[PDB]
Design a protein around this ligand. Structure first.
Ligand code: W37
Ligand code: W37
Ligand code: C8E
Ligand code: C8E
Lengths: 619, 619
């Protein structure tokens, strides 16, 4: 039956492999990436008319009939996103009359205008001079002085936030304005009666911070700020030290853009970091077949390559397949051997992790490290010396990263402070990196592949971690994947791996929850709305990836025979394309719960292959 | 007569122009550049077997019949240079038996061996493990803490020494060792009886510094050095902030190499700065037609371009000639508009100078700025707006750089401290950048082209400076050019330009001195030995460039009619090649009096052209 399905998927995946030996599917997000790129180009005075064109085509192509844009396909209109998209289009050349402009402008106004937008959106506008800097939450360069132990020192913020903050403190320190030509001014973003419905910090606006921010904006006003020139040079030096090999900063779109702006601010455009910073951008861009061009919020080569290998194995190719070997080799040259920001809390830990992107040594993550180490463990490469050593280095790095509560975070250990969540600036996404269920599960299944189990204290703490975190209904949250089906799929798959007993009560209570959501069409799906309204936990249009997740929980929990199981397998088998792939017009990946979603374009292919190989495995 | 000479010189000069519009002759020095390159490649573990071949080929080619190498062609053998050359060749592959190696080992031994070499040479050896680090003068990263006003703070050292020091302080901080394979160990450098004749600091060893060095070497021994980790990061940050666009550091070979080593030291090979620093090297290398390869101590495009223009004008081409225009334009895009290290002593000075090389924004120099500004002032470019503005900025920057005594240094204002000259480490070359006669002369002739004169305070102080510096015999020293003919040629040329009277006594006393040294062949020459032994002042084989310098002093002083003058012109006319060039197998350029000489390969063509055009001018 499914045999042919799997056989076709395998040859498909094997076809998508790049020459050097890795897999790399584009990462999808929302249009703020390209909208901000347009503004960035204006700031830096490097606008390519041809490029703007491809971006115009893209922006429009992404707009929906109602004239809005969303965080994910089939999602509610997003005010922030739509505002930026508007400004972008207007700049590129479209007049406010045009149908597209009109519908958008309407949505925007019916929402209270610009005053209802997140800090980032008002700050971008602040940069081009379409909004008062005085109304934008300050993050002073002095932040650079707070030492290792102290409220709000930069290491209390998560890796992604950290860099962004350092970068911005230079920007906000100078509050510069790069005027838009008259044709593009967007005063209409104010023309509304609807009362501004302001969004507050991700944790609550304690009156102290409102005061503190008011103080800072006042201190901005003064004629002299002692030691500020130094606070700035601190920020700058902090950035020069960590710039990634590809010219970016963290391999992510935000700080990369803000750093380039800061460099421009400091009259440093003729400097090596700026140049390399700028030219590196092209690697993240993508030529869309319909004449458009998008920019990736980040790139996922390691991740893709890691899972690709794991699936192609569970499927059936031999641990020494000449094709998997190329992958295994490539992965070995990616291991990070130098200390990164993580070392600030673990000075005596031997580096051995990996990163999401191609070259980003200072920010390896647990998830990628666990997947890569595990995936390697399943291969047989020529140099058995290196495979052995690398795993070892990576293995230990992971262990050494295990946070206090027994669970693993992504970038740091115990980056669990609560303080950062309350400042004015932090109104969008996460801002700290606490441990999560999904990463922990992946770490756990990593170890399990080796043969470690319940006995070893390490695991024990993790499992206890996972158990205290299970939701009432038996489900597990999904931090970096959408959502309960993602988490649950992982946890159960993991626990099975570390030797626990699939028969225990809470394991069953989870296994049951899965079956209870199988959609009529014999597969599973979960819409991104499940981060906002709980009515959507387990609910959504059936996707190939989420189906595979559910199937894995089922297969791990012993219920491979179950009807739900077979039914699921049917879905993946019927919905497969003639070439081997699977489509998936929905995002099944998470950036930040409620605020930012991602579409891992390889998930649709890899997980179904992996889930199927595991079904065949249990027979 | 000379008309044809001049015509052929022009069409030749014009032929050497590059497309983008500038001139760029290779800069010649000594083999320590290539020898150190070889060791650097070993340190960085990036040895190209083919490149080594082209290097072995050059190294041998430059060795004299006696088996030694010198600082300049036709010069005494140099211990330092020969030692490094030796080690380089041994590493590349030649055994200590070979004819060339034997002769060399002899000279080296007859001198007291390795113990008689400069700090830099023992330090390079120290790096590959062929010499105890304990015997190498220390320069601690803590140097980084000394503030603006304090003995030995880094801004008390000249621009070139500064960067080198910062770089090395990280290296000496860690005292690393990159062992040579056994085949290349060079213990024989010790095998000698001749008593070591140690070279001391450029100014004398005050017992304080020996004490200080001895303490510093003892402190190295300790198990913990508080605040050192900071000191290091201070140096690295100072270094990452100043890297040149071409990836170098200061556009000179020394700090560039040391910085790369320090980055290697700091486990930062996959950092943007390291990568750029490494790949930038190629631009400085040169393929020699006989199969060898050399590395330039530095590059002189701006300088070459500036003089080229000035000569082709004095020569006869129209101030709007299309070729000189390409040049004028190119020169405008080179003006530096941001502040450099010089601003530390002149915070309110508007940047507007130029550099020697292509892209080196933090280190513009008075000499290049004066020549470029002056040259621009003789052209008529399309955008007269920009020529007008550029000159004004350059002009004012120069004025703002005039040191206390009334003269001009090359990179800084009053970099006249005497303290640095006594520390153990400083045993080779200059280490501070005090004002010099030749740069001042050039600045003066620059203003003169605009018409300013004796009445403007600025010029008055400068002339008073030059007068207090004239030598007893009426000659003027040559800091950056070889030597008394270079300086005298300039001063007289300058003073004539600022309106002073060529009839005054001291002007005549100098003019006379020039005629006094005309060689029998009706031209002038001055050997590099004149920095060591005064019996060589004005004496040496005739060279085309030095002839031109003498001729300019003669022409400026009114004695164009003079027999010496005519005779000189005869020389330049008889010795000219069929194509229009002129040969010159001697170095006529100075790096550091006594210690480092340069061969500006364009001098032989440009000055004779300039001199001749000025002869024709006065008729
Ligand atoms: C599942 C395993 C792979 N790991 C590796 C997770 C991959 C997620 C990294 C890609 C997303 O990176 C970011 C990180 C921060 C982002 C921010 C952001 C938000 C708040 C602050 Br304050 C600063 C930046 N804004 C917009 C987009 C972003 C994408
Ligand atoms: C004449 C007009 C152009 N100006 C612009 C002068 C051009 C000279 C710059 C090229 C030489 O640059 C250097 C500078 C320093 C050099 C050092 C050196 C010596 C002692 C220390 Br302490 C550090 C470096 N060693 C070896 C070689 C060098 C060449
Ligand atoms: C630069 C001094 C050498 C410091 C030794 C390396 C130890 C660094 O401490 C780790 C924690 O600091 C955060 C990031 O390190 C990454 C980039 O800094 C690079 C230079 O070390
Ligand atoms: C970095 C914030 C300081 C901004 C003021 C610019 C003043 C720079 O000082 C000039 C002299 O200092 C040495 C070098 O300057 C070059 C590199 O520093 C770059 C960023 O300014």
């Amino acid at each position: 039956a499914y045999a042919r399905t799997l056989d076709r998927a395998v040859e498909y995946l094997l076809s998508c492999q790049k020459d050097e030996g890795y897999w790399w599917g584009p990462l999808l997000s929302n249009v703020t990436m390209e909208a901000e790129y347009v503004l960035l180009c204006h700031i830096l005075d490097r606008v390519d008319r041809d490029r703007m064109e491809k971006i115009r085509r893209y922006l429009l192509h992404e707009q929906r009939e109602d004239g809005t844009w969303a965080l994910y396909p089939g999602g509610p209109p997003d005010l922030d996103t739509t505002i930026e998209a508007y400004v972008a289009l207007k700049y590129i050349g479209m007049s406010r009359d045009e149908e597209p402009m009109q519908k958008a402008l309407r949505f925007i106004q019916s929402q209270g205008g610009i005053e209802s937008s997140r800090v980032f959106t008002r700050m971008w506008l602040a940069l081009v001079g379409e909004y008062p800097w005085e109304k934008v939450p300050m993050v002073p360069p002095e932040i650079m002085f707070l030492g290792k132990r102290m409220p709000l020192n930069i290491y209390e913020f998560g890796s992604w936030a950290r860099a962004t903050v350092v970068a911005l403190s230079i920007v906000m320190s100078r509050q510069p304005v790069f005027p838009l030509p008259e044709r593009a001014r967007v005063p209409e973003l104010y023309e509304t009666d609807v009362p501004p419905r302001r969004r507050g910090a991700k944790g609550g606006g304690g009156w102290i911070f409102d005061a503190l921010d008011r103080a800072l904006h006042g201190y901005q006003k003064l004629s002299v700020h002692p030691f500020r020139r130094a606070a700035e040079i601190r920020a700058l030096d902090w950035l020069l030290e960590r710039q990634a090999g590809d010219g970016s900063w963290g391999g992510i779109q935000p700080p990369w853009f803000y750093a380039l702006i800061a460099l421009k601010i400091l009259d440093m455009t003729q400097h090596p970091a700026f140049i390399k910073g700028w030219e590196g951008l092209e690697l993240y861009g993508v030529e869309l077949d319909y004449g458009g061009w998008m920019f990736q919020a980040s790139i996922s080569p390691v991740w893709d390559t890691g899972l690709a290998v794991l699936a192609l194995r569970a499927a059936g190719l031999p641990a020494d397949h000449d094709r998997l070997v190329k992958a295994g080799e490539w992965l070995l040259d990616r291991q990070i051997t130098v200390p990164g920001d993580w070392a600030v809390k673990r000075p005596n830990l031997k580096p051995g992790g990996f990163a999401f992107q191609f070259d980003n040594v200072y920010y390896p993550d647990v998830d990628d490290t666990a997947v890569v180490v595990w995936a390697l463990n399943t291969l047989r490469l020529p140099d058995e010396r290196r495979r052995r050593d690398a795993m070892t280095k990576g293995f230990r790095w992971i262990v050494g990263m295990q946070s206090s509560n027994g669970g693993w975070g992504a970038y740091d250990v115990d980056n669990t402070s609560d303080l950062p969540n309350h400042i004015p600036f932090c109104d969008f996404g996460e801002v700290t990196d606490p441990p999560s269920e999904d990463v922990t599960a992946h770490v756990l299944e990593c170890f399990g592949s080796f043969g470690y189990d319940d006995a070893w204290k390490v695991i024990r703490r993790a499992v206890e971690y996972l158990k205290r975190e299970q939701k009432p209904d038996g489900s597990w949250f999904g931090r970096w994947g959408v959502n309960y089906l993602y988490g649950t799929g992982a946890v159960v798959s993991a626990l099975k791996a570390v030797g626990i007993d699939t028969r225990e009560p809470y394991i069953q209570k989870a296994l049951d929850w899965v079956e209870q959501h199988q959609n009529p069409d014999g597969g599973w799906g979960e819409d991104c709305r499940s981060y906002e309204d709980p009515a959507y936990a387990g609910k959504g249009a059936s996707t190939p990836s989420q189906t595979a997740w559910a199937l894995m929980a089922l297969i791990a929990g012993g219920r491979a025979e179950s009807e739900a199981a077979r039914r699921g397998v049917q879905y993946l088998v019927e919905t497969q394309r003639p070439d081997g792939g699977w489509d998936e017009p929905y995002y099944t990946g998470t950036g930040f719960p409620g605020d930012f979603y991602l579409g891992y374009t390889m998930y649709r292919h890899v997980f179904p292959t992996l889930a199927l190989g595991r079904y065949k495995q249990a027979i």
